Amino acid sequence: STGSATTTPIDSLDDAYITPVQIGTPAQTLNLDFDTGSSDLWVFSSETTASEVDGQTIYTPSKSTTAKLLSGATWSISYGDGSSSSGDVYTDTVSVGGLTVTGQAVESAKKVSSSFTEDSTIDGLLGLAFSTLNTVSPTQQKTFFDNAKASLDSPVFTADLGYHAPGTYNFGFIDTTAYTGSITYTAVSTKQGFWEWTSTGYAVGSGTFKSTSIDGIADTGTTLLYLPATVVSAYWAQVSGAKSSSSVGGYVFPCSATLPSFTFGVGSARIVIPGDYIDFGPISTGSSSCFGGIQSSAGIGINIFGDVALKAAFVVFNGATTPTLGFASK
Ligand SMILES: C#CCN(C)Cc1nc([C@]2(O)CN[C@@H](c3nc(-c4ccc(C(F)(F)F)cc4)no3)C2)cs1
């Protein structure tokens, strides 16, 4: 089997991408944030504290003929920005782009933190990291991809995110029309539960390539590109007036600037992020200070190849017995 679904930016900045997901019988379609950096499928629901729901579409398990309470199971998760959610668990039929998993754990939120309430466009998350990170207790649950894998034509999914435009998540096949050149595959460590890999270095703009190993994770659920402070300083030093602002929380730059590209290494191959992809616009409405798309990982303890990086590439998440990651230009 295969599936294919379109993913769409939630706003003009590509702050996140949402993908429609069918849950239950008859189908209830919710727009979920596919997150290769976590492993829980959780939804706003008829159980979510009413004061914490503000425009989201909710899953109502009592209206699904295929929903079953996973008795005694609870879940609780936090994310890298400090946001969090928790609740109980149902199993139900879940379909993404024509690919169906029966008995998928659907984690129903009883509580969500303020940032989730405030994002009316995100109805929940669909985790695509390794199932060892799933938070369901006392019986840990598998991700949608892990449950689907044995049925797929090939044990893979691909992320083809757009720049200020929709893109595609495919399951079970590689669309050879969606990229240019070849896909370069690189080894993955699952030791932390992430799609963790080692970039071979970087370049700023038209500068020469710096060969250096950068461990990090491929994370579709993180907006920006977080790299070591040395690398990030070398990038922003090329932008007149760019500076790290503790009050804003990262590097800002004059909105009048044209940004240089940023290249990262995948083995002997290179992915080039155009400068425009690094522009996240005014820090507040009307400001002439703009927020940078490349930020330091120093405070978070892990380098994150988030959407800024991934949207410059066609990315293969290969969940074969020995997992790997593939990157192609597009
Ligand atoms: C700090 C630190 C050390 N480590 C935890 C950093 C890491 N952090 C992650 C992620 O938690 C998994 N992938 C990212 C992700 N964030 C979201 C998200 C968050 C908030 C909302 C909102 F604003 F709606 F509430 C929406 C989506 N979705 O995915 C972050 C992996 S490693």
DSSP state of 206: T
- Tell how strand 269-273 and strand 262-266 pair up: antiparallel
Side chain identity at 274, as an amino acid letter? P
Give CA 235 to chain center in angstroms. Answer: 23
**Beta carbons within 10 angstroms of residue 292's beta carbon:** 26
Contact 330, 274 (CB under 8 A): no
Resolution in angstrom units: 1.3
Classified as helix, coil or strand, 149 is: helix
Q: Is 277 exposed, middle or buried (0-12, 13-18, 19+ CB in 10 A)?
A: buried
Q: What is the DSSP string of 12-74?
A: TT---EEEEEEETTTTEEEEEEEETT---EEE-BTTS-GGG-SS---B-GGG-TT-EEEEEEE
Ordered by where they begin, the domains of the chain are: 5-174 (2.40.70.10), 175-330 (2.40.70.10)
**What's the DSSP call for residue 204?**
E
Bridge partners of 137, per DSSP, are 74
* Torsion angles phi and psi, residue 291, rounded to 5: -90, 135
The CA–CA distances, whole Å, from 232 to 107, 204, 267, 282 equal 37, 10, 21, 20
Task: Quickly list H helices, the chain.
Answer: 114-118, 144-148, 229-236, 307-310
What's the Cα-to-Cα distance from 145 to each of 36, 55, 246, 325, rounded to whole Å? 10, 28, 39, 15
Beta strands in 164-239 (DSSP E): 167-171, 184-187, 196-204, 210-218, 225-227
Determine contact, residues 227/297, Cβ cutoff 8 Å. yes
How remote is the C-alpha of 187 from its chain's centroid?
A: 19
Ligand 1 center–CA 223 separation, angstroms: 9
CA distance linking residue 7 with residue 167, whole number of Å: 5
Q: Give me the count of residues in the chain.
A: 330
Residues with catalytic function: 35, 199
**Which residues fall within 8 angstroms of residue 246, CB to CB, at 6 or more apart?**
none
Residues 6+ apart with CB under 8 A from 30: 20, 21, 23, 43, 44, 57, 58, 59, 123, 124
> How many C-alpha atoms does 147 have within 13 Å on its Cβ side?
25
Tell whether omega for the bond before 20 is within 30 degrees of 0, i.e. cis: no
Q: What span, in angstroms and rounded, lies between the C-alpha atoms of 182 and 329? A: 8
- Closest atom of ligand 1 to 35 CA is 29
Experimental approach was: X-ray
* Ligand 1 pocket check for 193: Cβ under 6 Å: no
Order the strands of the 225-227 sheet from edge to edge.
269-273, 262-266, 196-204, 210-218, 304-305, 225-227, 294-296
- The residues, any chain, with a CB within 8 Å of residue 5's CB and separated by 6 or more, are 19, 20, 21, 96, 97, 168, 169
Q: What angle do CA 112, 116, 120 make, to 5 degrees?
A: 125
184: Cβ–Cβ under 8 A, 6 or more apart, which residues? Answer: 266, 267, 268, 269, 326, 327, 328
Cα(256) to centroid(ligand 1), Å: 30
Q: How many CB atoms lie within 10 A of CB 183?
A: 20
By the 8 A CB rule, do 56 and 103 touch? Answer: no
Q: How far does residue 1's CA lie from ligand 1's centre (Å)? A: 30
**Backbone phi and psi for residue 274, each to the nearest 5 degrees, phi listed first:** -60, 150
What residue type is 240 in one-letter code? S
Q: Which atom number of ligand 1 is nearest to the Cα of residue 301?
A: 3
